[PDB]
Write a protein that holds these residues in place. Sequence first.
Motif, PDB file in Angstrom:
ATOM      1  N   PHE D  28      -0.222 -74.432  75.475  1.00 31.79           N
ATOM      2  CA  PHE D  28      -0.179 -74.773  74.466  1.00 31.79           C
ATOM      3  C   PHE D  28      -1.993 -75.133  73.984  1.00 31.79           C
ATOM      4  CE2 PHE D  28      -0.715 -79.278  72.517  1.00 31.79           C
ATOM      5  CZ  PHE D  28       0.208 -78.909  71.329  1.00 31.79           C
ATOM      6  N   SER D  29      -2.913 -74.204  74.899  1.00 32.79           N
ATOM      7  CA  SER D  29      -4.375 -73.259  74.193  1.00 32.79           C
ATOM      8  C   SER D  29      -4.071 -72.561  73.551  1.00 32.79           C
ATOM      9  CB  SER D  29      -4.471 -73.515  75.018  1.00 32.79           C
ATOM     10  OG  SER D  29      -4.250 -72.257  75.961  1.00 32.79           O
ATOM     11  N   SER D  30      -2.766 -71.831  73.137  1.00 35.17           N
ATOM     12  CA  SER D  30      -2.536 -71.399  72.058  1.00 35.17           C
ATOM     13  C   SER D  30      -1.956 -71.912  70.859  1.00 35.17           C
ATOM     14  CB  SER D  30      -1.635 -70.015  72.232  1.00 35.17           C
ATOM     15  OG  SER D  30      -0.435 -70.183  72.941  1.00 35.17           O
ATOM     16  N   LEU D  31      -1.054 -73.158  71.845  1.00 28.44           N
ATOM     17  CA  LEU D  31      -0.299 -73.695  70.848  1.00 28.44           C
ATOM     18  C   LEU D  31      -1.423 -74.539  69.514  1.00 28.44           C
ATOM     19  CD1 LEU D  31       2.156 -72.587  72.387  1.00 28.44           C
ATOM     20  CD2 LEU D  31       3.784 -74.224  70.918  1.00 28.44           C
ATOM     21  N   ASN D  32      -1.443 -74.426  68.960  1.00 35.83           N
ATOM     22  CA  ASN D  32      -3.162 -75.231  68.323  1.00 35.83           C
ATOM     23  C   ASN D  32      -2.155 -76.365  67.743  1.00 35.83           C
ATOM     24  OD1 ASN D  32      -5.614 -74.218  68.757  1.00 35.83           O
ATOM     25  ND2 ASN D  32      -5.117 -72.514  67.324  1.00 35.83           N
ATOM     26  N   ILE D  33      -3.079 -77.386  67.452  1.00 30.18           N
ATOM     27  CA  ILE D  33      -2.300 -78.734  66.939  1.00 30.18           C
ATOM     28  C   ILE D  33      -2.313 -78.618  65.782  1.00 30.18           C
ATOM     29  CG2 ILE D  33      -4.510 -80.190  67.271  1.00 30.18           C
ATOM     30  CD1 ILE D  33      -0.510 -81.306  68.352  1.00 30.18           C
ATOM     31  N   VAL D  34      -1.220 -79.496  64.619  1.00 33.89           N
ATOM     32  CA  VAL D  34      -1.469 -79.609  63.348  1.00 33.89           C
ATOM     33  C   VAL D  34      -1.136 -81.080  63.573  1.00 33.89           C
ATOM     34  CG1 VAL D  34      -1.156 -77.783  62.324  1.00 33.89           C
ATOM     35  CG2 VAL D  34       0.228 -78.678  63.177  1.00 33.89           C
ATOM     36  N   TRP D  35      -1.919 -82.325  62.862  1.00 33.73           N
ATOM     37  CA  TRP D  35      -1.404 -83.238  62.861  1.00 33.73           C
ATOM     38  C   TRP D  35      -1.279 -84.135  61.555  1.00 33.73           C
ATOM     39  CZ3 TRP D  35      -2.654 -85.879  67.482  1.00 33.73           C
ATOM     40  CH2 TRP D  35      -3.424 -84.489  68.325  1.00 33.73           C
ATOM     41  N   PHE D  36       0.272 -84.682  61.321  1.00 34.22           N
ATOM     42  CA  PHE D  36       0.272 -85.268  60.026  1.00 34.22           C
ATOM     43  C   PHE D  36       0.398 -86.317  60.032  1.00 34.22           C
ATOM     44  CE2 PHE D  36       2.315 -81.541  57.612  1.00 34.22           C
ATOM     45  CZ  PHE D  36       1.844 -80.279  58.271  1.00 34.22           C
ATOM     46  N   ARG D  37       0.930 -87.488  58.741  1.00 31.51           N
ATOM     47  CA  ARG D  37       0.705 -87.896  58.341  1.00 31.51           C
ATOM     48  C   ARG D  37       1.703 -88.114  57.642  1.00 31.51           C
ATOM     49  NH1 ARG D  37       0.095 -92.700  54.088  1.00 31.51           N
ATOM     50  NH2 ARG D  37       0.875 -91.205  53.286  1.00 31.51           N
ATOM     51  N   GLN D  38       2.344 -90.098  57.660  1.00 28.41           N
ATOM     52  CA  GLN D  38       3.803 -90.230  56.776  1.00 28.41           C
ATOM     53  C   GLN D  38       3.750 -91.967  56.779  1.00 28.41           C
ATOM     54  OE1 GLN D  38       7.189 -91.359  60.217  1.00 28.41           O
ATOM     55  NE2 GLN D  38       7.473 -89.848  58.601  1.00 28.41           N
ATOM     56  N   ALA D  39       2.968 -92.098  55.699  1.00 29.44           N
ATOM     57  CA  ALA D  39       2.899 -93.358  54.979  1.00 29.44           C
ATOM     58  C   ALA D  39       4.175 -94.505  55.244  1.00 29.44           C
ATOM     59  CB  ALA D  39       2.486 -93.173  53.404  1.00 29.44           C
ATOM     60  N   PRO D  40       4.049 -96.020  55.325  1.00 29.24           N
ATOM     61  CA  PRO D  40       5.415 -96.033  55.790  1.00 29.24           C
ATOM     62  C   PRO D  40       6.286 -96.262  53.963  1.00 29.24           C
ATOM     63  CG  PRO D  40       3.429 -97.656  55.520  1.00 29.24           C
ATOM     64  CD  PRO D  40       3.076 -96.930  55.358  1.00 29.24           C
ATOM     65  N   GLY D  41       7.493 -95.510  53.883  1.00 30.97           N
ATOM     66  CA  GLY D  41       8.432 -95.739  53.476  1.00 30.97           C
ATOM     67  C   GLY D  41       7.869 -94.134  52.230  1.00 30.97           C
ATOM     68  N   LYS D  42       6.473 -93.536  51.647  1.00 25.36           N
ATOM     69  CA  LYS D  42       6.084 -93.390  50.718  1.00 25.36           C
ATOM     70  C   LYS D  42       6.026 -91.534  51.343  1.00 25.36           C
ATOM     71  CE  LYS D  42       3.511 -96.801  48.512  1.00 25.36           C
ATOM     72  NZ  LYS D  42       3.358 -97.508  49.118  1.00 25.36           N
ATOM     73  N   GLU D  43       5.455 -90.705  50.465  1.00 30.64           N
ATOM     74  CA  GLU D  43       5.548 -89.253  51.310  1.00 30.64           C
ATOM     75  C   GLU D  43       4.828 -88.679  52.289  1.00 30.64           C
ATOM     76  OE1 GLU D  43       3.332 -86.430  49.519  1.00 30.64           O
ATOM     77  OE2 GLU D  43       4.875 -85.212  50.394  1.00 30.64           O
ATOM     78  N   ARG D  44       5.160 -87.952  52.813  1.00 29.35           N
ATOM     79  CA  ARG D  44       4.106 -87.517  54.257  1.00 29.35           C
ATOM     80  C   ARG D  44       2.947 -86.453  53.589  1.00 29.35           C
ATOM     81  NH1 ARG D  44       7.600 -84.435  58.690  1.00 29.35           N
ATOM     82  NH2 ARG D  44       6.190 -84.248  59.946  1.00 29.35           N
ATOM     83  N   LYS D  45       2.579 -86.593  54.611  1.00 34.63           N
ATOM     84  CA  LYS D  45       0.684 -86.127  54.300  1.00 34.63           C
ATOM     85  C   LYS D  45       0.566 -85.540  55.285  1.00 34.63           C
ATOM     86  CE  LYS D  45      -3.693 -86.930  52.138  1.00 34.63           C
ATOM     87  NZ  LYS D  45      -4.434 -86.755  53.567  1.00 34.63           N
ATOM     88  N   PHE D  46      -0.299 -84.658  55.517  1.00 37.69           N
ATOM     89  CA  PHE D  46      -1.353 -84.000  56.821  1.00 37.69           C
ATOM     90  C   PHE D  46      -2.758 -84.617  57.239  1.00 37.69           C
ATOM     91  CE2 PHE D  46      -5.230 -81.437  56.555  1.00 37.69           C
ATOM     92  CZ  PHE D  46      -5.085 -81.123  54.591  1.00 37.69           C
ATOM     93  N   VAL D  47      -2.980 -84.904  58.265  1.00 38.68           N
ATOM     94  CA  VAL D  47      -3.850 -85.293  59.224  1.00 38.68           C
ATOM     95  C   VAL D  47      -5.496 -84.337  59.226  1.00 38.68           C
ATOM     96  CG1 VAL D  47      -5.545 -86.466  60.064  1.00 38.68           C
ATOM     97  CG2 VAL D  47      -3.206 -87.231  59.524  1.00 38.68           C
ATOM     98  N   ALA D  48      -5.490 -83.094  60.353  1.00 35.20           N
ATOM     99  CA  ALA D  48      -6.138 -82.487  60.850  1.00 35.20           C
ATOM    100  C   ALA D  48      -5.559 -81.253  61.463  1.00 35.20           C
ATOM    101  CB  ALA D  48      -7.380 -83.439  61.485  1.00 35.20           C
ATOM    102  N   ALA D  49      -6.032 -80.982  62.170  1.00 39.29           N
ATOM    103  CA  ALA D  49      -5.613 -79.262  62.431  1.00 39.29           C
ATOM    104  C   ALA D  49      -6.851 -78.553  64.002  1.00 39.29           C
ATOM    105  CB  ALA D  49      -5.104 -78.825  61.797  1.00 39.29           C
ATOM    106  N   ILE D  50      -6.954 -78.699  64.690  1.00 36.77           N
ATOM    107  CA  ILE D  50      -8.001 -78.068  65.403  1.00 36.77           C
ATOM    108  C   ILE D  50      -7.367 -76.682  65.995  1.00 36.77           C
ATOM    109  CG2 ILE D  50      -7.301 -79.308  68.031  1.00 36.77           C
ATOM    110  CD1 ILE D  50     -10.343 -78.889  68.916  1.00 36.77           C
ATOM    111  N   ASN D  51      -7.360 -75.712  64.800  1.00 41.92           N
ATOM    112  CA  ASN D  51      -6.877 -74.540  65.028  1.00 41.92           C
ATOM    113  C   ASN D  51      -8.311 -73.576  65.837  1.00 41.92           C
ATOM    114  OD1 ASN D  51      -8.760 -74.060  62.698  1.00 41.92           O
ATOM    115  ND2 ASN D  51      -7.011 -73.600  61.806  1.00 41.92           N
TER     116      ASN D  51
END
Lengths: 50, 50, 116, 116, 50
Positions: D28-51
């Motif tokens: 999973f070290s090779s599988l870099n993470i991406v954080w995503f954000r969704q509002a409570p009933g609104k459109e989605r979005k991202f947060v961060a990624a330690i690539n």
Amino acid sequence: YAWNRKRISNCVADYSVLYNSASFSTFKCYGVSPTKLNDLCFTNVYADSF
Amino acid sequence: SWMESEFRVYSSANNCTFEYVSQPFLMDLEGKQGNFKNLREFVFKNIDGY
Amino acid sequence: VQLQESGGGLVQAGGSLRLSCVASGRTFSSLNIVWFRQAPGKERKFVAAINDRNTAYAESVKGRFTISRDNAKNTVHLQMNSLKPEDTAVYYCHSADVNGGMDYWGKGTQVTVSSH
Amino acid sequence: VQLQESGGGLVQAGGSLRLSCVASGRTFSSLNIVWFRQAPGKERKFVAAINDRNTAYAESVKGRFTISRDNAKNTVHLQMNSLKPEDTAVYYCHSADVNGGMDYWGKGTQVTVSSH
Amino acid sequence: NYLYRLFRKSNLKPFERDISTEIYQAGSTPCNGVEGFNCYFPLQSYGFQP
């Protein structure tokens, strides 16, 4: 409700003065990316300011 | 000396889009020579909107 | 070019005035005249608006206000009758074409109502 | 083989949370993470990624966070600082491997924050 | 849940997979880290809804 209408014709429209400026907070082109503006010509352009 | 003060060609222009104006200069307004000393031959074309 | 306005004056309550709006241009007929005033220390509110031969007035300015246009002389009148202290404000005339572009704003004229 | 996201408890404005996305895997070290954000009933979005080498945040969480890596554990972790009541969302975390494109999407964690 | 790649320096070669989450240098003047109205994220989400 009184949106302007100004004609733009027979000119060169370099965007290195417009897009590169950080003042324009909102800049969304629904047909192309802002980069391709200069590389492609245009036609009768209307300037509508409000 | 000869001067021009009458310009009766068109009444009013509403939809004005394209315009080219040359730099101001002077042309002759006098001369009553009988025999012609010059000739100006002009060709006008309109191809593909050009 | 800043618009020129004249025809106001300091008179007592119930007086009359005739405000003028002057602009340069052959399309003066195709434009429109809108009036807005700002009371001293109070927010600017609607005054009057004329659309060719049409006339419209707001809730508290109907009847008293009457606006007419003389598009040949490039002068639009704003006839005033029965001035009241709540009408004490400086009036500006607004220009708007068939689309609303090429708008111009002027200094305007001072209108003051004096109470007995 | 899969990812589970746990955490996102009840905290106060300006507090610190510790959310971990433990991954069932071995690289999973090779599988870099991406954080995503969704509002409570609104459109989605991202947060961060330690690539791996560097990082990249979002406009809402610009520099306010301290993203962390747990390479010795093959797990990812986000540090939440300067939390706001307007960030009440459901953060996600995902990683796609370089070989044989595939997704290990998680479930989500609440980011409910009070205001006073 | 279904994300797609939108920003890249060029067209990827046939049968090539690009999963790099690094920020694309979208603007003419490079900006590094996070984003403003420039160097935006190369991943966008499908709004798949019944």
